[PDB]
């Protein structure tokens, strides 16, 4: 007890997943404030796991007002070594269809006003200046776990660099992808959606950043599964994103999301992470510029 | 019945549109509006006028209380908001003296309060995710364009008309705006990049005003006033405040004409269904419910 | 005459540019500066030094009080600010050990106090919309470039020289920076997009320092340093070159008359006051 342990952050359409029988419910505080909700601990098989809804169980907290620092820190505090996160998103690409999933490997950040670092010279932060490399922002091993889990659960995986497009059979998990994270709470204009598309981005979401950055700052291995619920608004009027559209597609996909997450947890449990964890901690220390 | 709010930007902080009924100070749950409001009538149509920046222009674009301004107009019972925004052209065919009835934007503002809803005490309870694919009221945009036609001002529609048929000064029937935070103008580097993205104009005051109007269930449309070519051309043509004001002055008369004709045209129609649909859109965007 | 302020970024957290003469710990209407300002002379030219990040580099780019730093310099009587910035390259021709006298930027910062003027209780009353088409002081840029030449450092200008003249290490005579908020570095995706926009370098501290300098009626120019043990040593060498360039630059500034330019800097601030219409 207790390394390794998997934190799971649930977004839209995934506010109150019943992933396992609750063992403990933790009301915690962090040096950066309260988490979105109480943290629920238990087991998937023999693997310690902790579940946390990003927006509160009642989804009363908008993406821009989520205390990403407290959520990640609380997970760290409870002994998590990994975080798996879900993120509802819209597709900016023809090959990414509602019902698909994307194991993101890249992002472009257009958020603001969100506390995005544990470190600084304000009293509300830890002392120091952390300049973390983010060139490939996710934990690669954990990404591959998510993909291998999809395969273990007989869900199609599409890998651009190894398969031709005819092998892109829906619904499928895309083995790579880039996300633009917008601040919200409004969805994009068509003008924004076309610009994002022209930039080469795969999907658009509101919740990926700064969660992914803070996980790394926290010395944790993080990976996102993005649930494609819509085509944003670059296609026809009938295909223009709204809350109803996002929710309806998510409820159709939740079963697969649950399956991937539970299998991913087991697979993380079947491996040693001593060196990777050590390298996570080390990357943090080497990143100190103070 | 219909009641039209008019929000006035740079070069239009004393619109003097009609002859005043009275001046009125209001309070909102989101703070004080930019100034008192002038209430009156255009013909038989109730109209309310609010300068965005205060009558002395002491409030910069990034510090304008757009929530309070928009909520104040809702609270006076406005069904529509017509806005003006001074802007720079990033394109050859949009020249100073022209107007643009915007249909799209790209948002580069930050630090502004851009929603009425949240989980903080200074906001309404709820998580509201408005669709914004086509962010204006289309009926109201078309009324602004018709108003221009009716006041014998040239209308240019790049969808039905060739570039050689562009006669200035003209109202462009569509256009997209990048809204920057201010208060500084753009670098040449920034202007070239916005231009490369395919944006038509640059301004500082469209967003979040347009988004809040939709959140408030109001029909909103903007007329952009081209006062300069930003800074993508030669040095003599690089935007500064004096250039902005000098051109805005020359264009104001046309701006006034369109707005007043627009107010009349809105009042001549029934908006019962549109208003219901406006209200329903808000309700359907509540994810917390 | 003139007085040259120097804002030292990474590598210049605690410089020894001249014999310390005066020490000034000030308080501005916009808060405290990053650290004490150090007074002195380069030859006959009055000079002031201030480390952007503070002596311990405790202060992250996004929490630097740029307003206080610039205002403090203005208050001490500075007419010029020369600034250094450590940066990453986005283009093949810009390599570690190179330098760039910037002439352009694209701003991606947010959350920073970026203007002296506004309606908030602690801003200067007024609305200021400064032109920023060419946001540096051009005479001052050319002084930096000349300073590089006077210290025998290669100068490369892609607009007037063949690629063959790009001999490293070199001062690139023009260049554009994207200024990101930090403190994290860019993802590959972000860098790809910035590069595709045509940006030359990426940094975290240029904006709003350059904007504020202009609002203050000061002449500002920036010398960027393009940046394991061989990288550290290279950066140590870069700092030595920049130190030399700035010293020569202060001398070169003091040798010229700046009456009209200073006047015109001041007139640009007044003509940008929209509230004074
Ligand atoms: N199109 C979209 N943009 C942003 N966040 C989203 N979440 C789901 N769909 C989205
Ligand atoms: N070029 C410009 N940029 C931003 N706001 C403006 N308002 C008028 N011209 C402008």
Author numbering:
A (entry chain B): 1 to 290
B (entry chain A): 3 to 291
C (entry chain C): 3 to 229, 243 to 292
Paper passage:
The SmMTAP-adenine complex is the most common structure obtained (23 of the 66 monomers). Further, adenine was identified in the SmMTAP active site after crystallization and structural solution and was probably acquired from the bacterial source. In other complexes, adenine was present in only two subunits of the trimer. The subunits without adenine preferentially assume the conformation of the APO structure (open conformation) of the gate loop (residues 231–242) and part of the helix 5 (residues 240–252). The adenine molecule or adenine moiety of MTA forms three H-bonds within residues D230 (2) and D232 (1) and one H-bond with a water molecule, which is anchored by the side chain of residues D232 and S118. Despite these exceptions, the MTAP-adenine complex, which is the region near D230, assumes a conformation in which D230 points toward the adenine molecule. The glycerol that was found in RBS in some structures with adenine came from the cryoprotection solution. The carbon atoms of glycerol lie in the same position of C3', C4' and C5' in the ribose moiety of nucleoside. The glycerol forms four H-bonds: one with residue S12, one with adenine N9 and two with the water molecules present in RBS. Catalysis of nucleosides by nucleoside phosphorylases in the absence of phosphate was observed for bovine uridine phosphorylase, where the enzyme produces a free base and a glycal as products of catalysis, and for calf spleen purine nucleoside phosphorylase. This could be the reason for our failure to obtain adenosine or MTA complexes for wt SmMTAP, for which we only observed adenine in the active site, even when using ammonium sulphate in crystallization conditions.
